[PDB]
Design a binder for this molecule. Structure first.
Ligand SMILES: *[C@@H]1O[C@H](CO)[C@@H](O[C@@H]2O[C@H](CO)[C@@H](O)[C@H](O)[C@H]2NC(C)=O)[C@H](O)[C@H]1NC(C)=O
Ligand SMILES: *[C@@H]1O[C@H](CO)[C@@H](O[C@@H]2O[C@H](CO)[C@@H](O)[C@H](O)[C@H]2NC(C)=O)[C@H](O)[C@H]1NC(C)=O
Ligand SMILES: *[C@@H]1O[C@H](CO)[C@@H](O[C@@H]2O[C@H](CO)[C@@H](O)[C@H](O)[C@H]2NC(C)=O)[C@H](O)[C@H]1NC(C)=O
Ligand SMILES: *[C@@H]1O[C@H](CO)[C@@H](O[C@@H]2O[C@H](CO)[C@@H](O)[C@H](O)[C@H]2NC(C)=O)[C@H](O)[C@H]1NC(C)=O
Ligand SMILES: *[C@@H]1O[C@H](CO)[C@@H](O)[C@H](O)[C@H]1NC(C)=O
Ligand SMILES: *[C@@H]1O[C@H](CO)[C@@H](O)[C@H](O)[C@H]1NC(C)=O
Ligand SMILES: *[C@@H]1O[C@H](CO)[C@@H](O)[C@H](O)[C@H]1NC(C)=O
Ligand SMILES: *[C@@H]1O[C@H](CO)[C@@H](O)[C@H](O)[C@H]1NC(C)=O
Ligand SMILES: *[C@@H]1O[C@H](CO)[C@@H](O)[C@H](O)[C@H]1NC(C)=O
Ligand SMILES: *[C@@H]1O[C@H](CO)[C@@H](O)[C@H](O)[C@H]1NC(C)=O
Ligand SMILES: *[C@@H]1O[C@H](CO)[C@@H](O)[C@H](O)[C@H]1NC(C)=O
Ligand SMILES: *[C@@H]1O[C@H](CO)[C@@H](O)[C@H](O)[C@H]1NC(C)=O
Lengths: 50, 631, 30, 199, 50, 50
């Protein structure tokens, strides 16, 4: 359920942000999204270790 | 005006260490019962300040001023009065004047001509007169004036029992001038050399001279024949340091500890406390520092033909944009920066201001002329007619674009029909490609070649230019510079001069922009003719080829290692030992030098007996034979 | 001062990357 | 970078202010050319921010010492402008003003026309002391401030003591009451009654 | 004591940013600050679990 | 091996960022790099604790 959040970006859906934004600066937003997803996965893995 | 005095047998100034004086509130904020770490210009603890004694006796020479000074006078009868600040004192440079003799404090900034002996002392016969107050011979243009209330003064002239101690610290920064002051009474001591104790300093005033200060002179108060009383002052110099300050519940600074004096002070600073229990602690990290700097650029002295490109007689149309190559020359972008209006100069991958410091491998200039309404379409990843069917830049383009107005040249009153552009294209074109084929747009469902008609269109259209057109439609000239960085041996770049080459020493090398620090040695590997830089597992360059001479150099970082402090409890003795983790013990004697090591303290390296363990060498402890229980 | 089984135990367990550990990574001794 | 910045008037990289420039070709431009505006062109080194120089010493370029008056390799460090209305745009005189200021570390000296109001104590209000927007309750304080101090900070570097601009006493700021809420409940089937605990 | 750090923003005081800047770039700096504080809180939680 | 990732910046080497960009723009790139490296180091510390 956590992957539905926007993480402060324009929109949670990945493909729509490419068309509505110029490619010069959409990389920042998609990198923010990828960092948020990586953080969530790392938290889950640590809990599983415990 | 003053009269020549001379007849002085100067004696070298005295020296005396200052125990704990010279600490001031760094900000106008209230804090209660908390330890705070600050970093600013301070007076190092236990530093040897210069002592001047004036009684017959006349000692007040000019002294250097740099990074602020600390001036402390132990005086009774108000002998020292004011200060003079300047750099030349020759009526050619602005000079300060701070005089608080009897009436008020007067602060003047003016092009004074300070005479040979600035003073207010020598008057008939042995009692002071407020004559020669015009120590300045002239005042041409004075730019700042400020008057305020005076300080605590005294009457008559005495000799002995010098109660009053006045401490001042002066510091100039970013044009501003700042003074902090403190007054301490009832300081009587049979010995000289300052009292022992702690006392903070409050901020007094601030004032924006915004001038250059490098030296200063003291002022004190007929010309031949005068007897003066006892007087003593002390001068010290500031420098950037980090301190740990302790406040109390009443909000007053009570104690402070330095963080660069001794290893014990270092561990006190890193523990954020004033007491440390017995044990081994880990402290600031050892690290050696660079002596000299070197650069290395290719030996080329020719010049690039930027003038021909930017002053070309004719520019080709958009659908046939002109491309030129620049290589094997020295490119100076200063001429591009200033000459001609150049209403738009915008870069993407590199800031233009630094464009004179990099090195490229291939530079391509693409020139054309467009309409004024489409200049915004040159940006990468854009839309519109001109950015789609005539000329498109890649998304990751790394270069610059320069567009300027040329209404005088291209526009013609009769009409300029010489400029053409594609209006109809079957599909979007790939970046950095050109189209010239003239085929009629068969935009219909019929096999039409024809000449004109429905669904049978000539794709090309002619720009029309005339001076009557308003702003936004007059022709604009556009030149785009493209290049790739660092991926190949350099061929064209700026004019920075080279220097010599250093081996087996820690220097700040610069090989075609690779700013870094380390020691360079001769390697024993073979490069390919198309390779210049060697990488490693961490993707940090470690093998380089010198441009001027074809030699292979290998880079390794500076020497470093951890540092630990062995100490008994602060309740017990304060003697400590130092351990250099994981290093042979013959490197640290070599490291012994000032301005070379990150830890400023170096007395311990040439200290007590050194004993090598398997985890470095311990300095400061002797090795006994008999064994005990581990502590 | 080692026995016979301890010799085999020492030899059967093994402990240049340390050169490329310049990036502030060390190993303290026991 | 350039001549005017590096030789006449340079701003610090951390500048906190405003700049206003306009075109005044209607006034300073002269029919015969204006030569009453001077600017430096030669200097021996870059200057630190907000520095002023007036000396007009003789500039020496070559290794041969220069003295007397201007000459070969011995130039005058000043030059003048040339203003007539027939120059193109980009050469007429431009009048420039720069406003510089520092933010909120000392007693206030100048700000907008916002009206004052009466004071309230021992009540949760939205105070505003010289731009210090916040919330809390203001009580009488007994700590002693030095005359040059205005704000008091805690271990978290947030303000908790202030000095009223109009009357010069000291006010102590403490935050609002807050806490958690818990619900005690039996099963849904048994009943719908609940209890509330304020932690 | 962690929340006294700027985390690369312009100030550690949250009300100063809003009252000195408009609504178009202040969000970037408050975003930096909120990410830093969130990371610190997560680290504290993990330490407590251990 | 993990410090060879660009993390979203222009280049993974720190000196090229300062020698190719102005300070104002370089702030963002070095901020991204430093945040990524801090995150990796924290992850290593947690694994060591376990
Ligand atoms: C530019 O000047 C440098 C400086 O002398 C020249 O470098 C020399 O190159 C030769 C040939 O490889 C070497 O044997 C010398 O030892 C180099 N000199 C130094 C001081 O290292 C370089 O050759 C010059 N460029 C050209 C094109 O001649
Ligand atoms: C390069 O030219 C070829 C030949 O004209 C183009 O290939 C045609 O592309 C259109 C686009 O839909 C197709 O309808 C044709 O069937 C293609 N013909 C052939 C023979 O392949 C190609 O598109 C051109 N390249 C670009 C980038 O436009
Ligand atoms: C302030 O004045 C001093 C001297 O009055 C200047 O010091 C000069 O420093 C340069 C270093 O590049 C030397 O070459 C000069 O010889 C020094 N001057 C003299 C007279 O010896 C200092 O540069 C001035 N500050 C500024 C910002 O210009
Ligand atoms: C205007 O502001 C001044 C500045 O504080 C006020 O002066 C204070 O007056 C009170 C009442 O007499 C004194 O207790 C304070 O000591 C004064 N301030 C200082 C710094 O001495 C003045 O009263 C204000 N006047 C009005 C009409 O608001
Ligand atoms: C004092 O003597 C110096 C050198 O002897 C001279 O340059 C200066 O003009 C003298 N001052 C006066 C006031 O005569
Ligand atoms: C520095 O202080 C010591 C301590 O008294 C003194 O002996 C020494 O002479 C001082 N330095 C100089 C250059 O005089
Ligand atoms: C000071 O007094 C002495 C002795 O009376 C005299 O020679 C000298 O001229 C006096 N100085 C002045 C400036 O009057
Ligand atoms: C172009 O020519 C003009 C006059 O001929 C000159 O002032 C200008 O500097 C030239 N531009 C370049 C880049 O050389
Ligand atoms: C410190 O030493 C004194 C005497 O040496 C002793 O009375 C005191 O208890 C000691 N304090 C601590 C904390 O060990
Ligand atoms: C330092 O190196 C020398 C020569 O290799 C060696 O004899 C000595 O034991 C070394 N000492 C330490 C402490 O590493
Ligand atoms: C320790 O023993 C060695 C070997 O007998 C001897 O050389 C050395 O002097 C002894 N040191 C002390 C402090 O007794
Ligand atoms: C209703 O909830 C109670 C819990 O208090 C449970 O004992 C009972 O079995 C439940 N009845 C249902 C689910 O029908």
């Amino acid at each position: 359920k956590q992957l539905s959040s926007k993480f402060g970006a324009i929109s949670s859906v990945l493909n729509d942000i490419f068309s509505r934004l110029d490619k010069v600066e959409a990389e920042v937003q998609i990198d923010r999204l990828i960092t948020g997803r990586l953080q969530s996965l790392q938290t889950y893995v640590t809990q599983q270790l415990i | 005006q003053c009269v020549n005095l001379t007849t002085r047998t100067q004696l070298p100034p005295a020296y005396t260490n200052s125990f704990t004086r010279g600490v001031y509130y760094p900000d106008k904020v209230f804090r209660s019962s908390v330890l705070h770490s600050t970093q600013d210009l301070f007076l190092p603890f236990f530093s040897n300040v210069t002592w001047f004694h004036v009684i017959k006796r006349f000692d007040n020479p000019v002294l250097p001023f740099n990074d602020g000074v600390y001036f402390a006078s132990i005086e009774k009868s108000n002998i020292i009065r004011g200060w003079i600040f300047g750099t030349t004192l020759d009526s050619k440079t602005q000079s300060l004047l701070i005089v608080n003799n009897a009436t008020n404090v007067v602060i003047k900034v003016c092009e004074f001509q300070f005479c040979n002996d600035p003073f207010l002392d020598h008057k008939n016969n042995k009692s002071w007169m407020e004559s020669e107050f015009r120590v300045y011979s002239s005042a041409n243009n004075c730019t700042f004036e400020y008057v305020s209330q005076p300080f605590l003064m005294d009457l008559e002239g005495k000799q002995g029992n010098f109660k009053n101690l006045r401490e001042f610290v002066f510091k100039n920064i970013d044009g501003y001038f700042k003074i902090y002051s403190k007054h301490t009474p009832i300081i009587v001591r049979e010995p000289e050399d300052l009292p022992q104790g702690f006392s903070a300093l409050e901020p007094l005033v601030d004032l924006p001279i915004g001038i250059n200060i490098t030296r200063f002179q003291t002022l004190l108060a007929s010309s031949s024949g005068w007897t003066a009383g006892a007087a003593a002052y002390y001068v010290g110099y500031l420098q950037p340091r980090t301190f740990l300050l302790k406040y109390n519940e009443n909000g007053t600074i009570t104690d402070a500890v330095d963080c660069a004096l001794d290893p014990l002070s270092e561990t006190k600073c890193t523990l954020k406390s004033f007491t440390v229990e017995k044990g081994i602690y880990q402290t600031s990290n050892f690290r050696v520092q660079p002596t000299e700097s070197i650069v290395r650029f290719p030996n080329i002295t020719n010049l690039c033909p930027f003038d021909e490109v930017f002053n070309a007689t004719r520019f080709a149309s958009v659908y046939a944009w002109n491309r030129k190559r620049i290589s094997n020359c020295v490119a100076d972008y200063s001429v591009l920066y200033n000459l001609a209006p150049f209403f738009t100069f915008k870069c993407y991958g590199v800031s233009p201001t630094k464009l004179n410091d990099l090195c490229f491998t291939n530079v391509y200039a693409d020139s054309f002329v467009i309409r004024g309404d489409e200049v915004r379409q040159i940006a990468p990843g854009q839309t519109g007619k001109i950015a789609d069917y005539n000329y498109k830049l890649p998304d990751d383009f790394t270069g610059c674009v320069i567009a300027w107005n040329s209404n005088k040249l291209d526009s013609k009153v009769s009409g300029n029909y010489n400029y053409l552009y594609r209006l109809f294209r079957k599909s979007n074109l790939k970046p950095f490609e050109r189209d010239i084929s003239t085929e009629i747009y068969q935009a219909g469902n019929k096999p039409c070649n024809g000449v004109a008609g429905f669904n049978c269109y000539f794709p090309l259209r002619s720009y029309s230019f005339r001076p009557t057109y308003g702003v936004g439609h007059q022709p604009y000239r556009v030149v785009v510079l493209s290049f790739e960085l660092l991926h190949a041996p350099a061929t064209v770049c700026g004019p920075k001069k080279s220097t010599n080459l250093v081996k087996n020493k820690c220097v700040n090398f610069n090989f075609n922009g690779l700013k870094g620090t380390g020691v360079l040695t001769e390697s024993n590997k073979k490069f390919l003719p198309f390779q210049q830089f060697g990488r490693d597992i961490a993707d940090t360059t470690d093998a380089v080829r010198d441009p001027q001479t074809l030699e292979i150099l290998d880079i390794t970082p500076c020497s470093f290692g951890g540092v630990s402090v062995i100490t008994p409890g602060t309740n017990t003795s304060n003697q400590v030992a130092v351990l250099y983790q994981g290093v042979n013990c013959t490197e640290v004697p070599v490291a012994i030098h000032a301005d070379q090591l990150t830890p400023t303290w170096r007395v311990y390296s040439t200290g007590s007996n050194v004993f090598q363990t398997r985890a470095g060498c311990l300095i400061g402890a002797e090795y006994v034979n008999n064994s005990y229980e581990c502590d | 001062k080692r026995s016979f089984i301890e010799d085999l135990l020492f030899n059967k367990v093994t402990l240049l990357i340390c050169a490329q550990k310049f990036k502030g990574l060390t190993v303290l001794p026991p």
